[PDB]
Amino acid sequence: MKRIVPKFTEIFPVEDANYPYSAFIASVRKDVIKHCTDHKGIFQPVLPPEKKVPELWLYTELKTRTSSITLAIRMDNLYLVGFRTPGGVWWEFGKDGDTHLLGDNPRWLGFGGRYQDLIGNKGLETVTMGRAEMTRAVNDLAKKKKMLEPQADTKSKLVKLVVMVCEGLRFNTVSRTVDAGFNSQHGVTLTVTQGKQVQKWDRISKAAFEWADHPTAVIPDMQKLGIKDKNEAARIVALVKNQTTAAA
Secondary structure: OOOOOOOEEEHHHHHHHHOOHHHHHHHHHHHHHHHEEEOOOOEEEEOOOOOOOOOEEEEEEEEOOOOEEEEEEEEEOOOEEEEOOOOOOOOOOOOOOOHHHOOOOOOOOHHHHHHHHHHOOOOOOOOEEEEHHHHHHHHHHHOOOOOOOOHHHHHHHHHHHHHHHHHHHHHHHHHHHHHHHHHOOOOOOOOOHHHHHOOOHHHHHHHHHHHOOOOOOOOOHHHOOOOOHHHHHHHHOEEEEOOOOOOO
């Protein structure tokens, strides 16, 4: 009826690091590229426009030693729209405004998904990423119920998961950062350049299109990150939003 069920779910044992993060992303990447379309002058696969009720969407489950979390990636945005607690409820990014995408009406996370939520003045880039912090984050999200006291703490844990996992599907840069770092005992710590550029994927999706018709343009938006070339963009990113064919 109103619920748009995902076809299947991709379940991933996080604790057993047998497969690299490169292979993890590659597996999901191949299937989403099938859904994307080409565009002239854009090497990167281009997403479809935003359907509210598509044919399907990407449902993924990160399962650790002790805990399980499902994350809902709408294929049309490749954004983490919502989540499943193992208590059998769902959550969605927003407040006082749910969507029937998560099946039955989810709860609301109350905030967005960026550094401005957690800290504002400081960056997110100080957060260590690694096997321990992923497992901790999954535990710390799995222990949630309809009410819990450390709202901001569980929120910072899901911010590192989205930047590692979801942005990783759109960004070879954070993918390879996490690939080298996840298997480490110390983990890795990102930088301001990576932190801001990944979450503002809209800036990538305009830059890639502006580089479409003009193969040697210079884009001041993207040059700030050291990315003066579409080649440099293509080896940093993986996928780009549906950009309507305006002018480039």
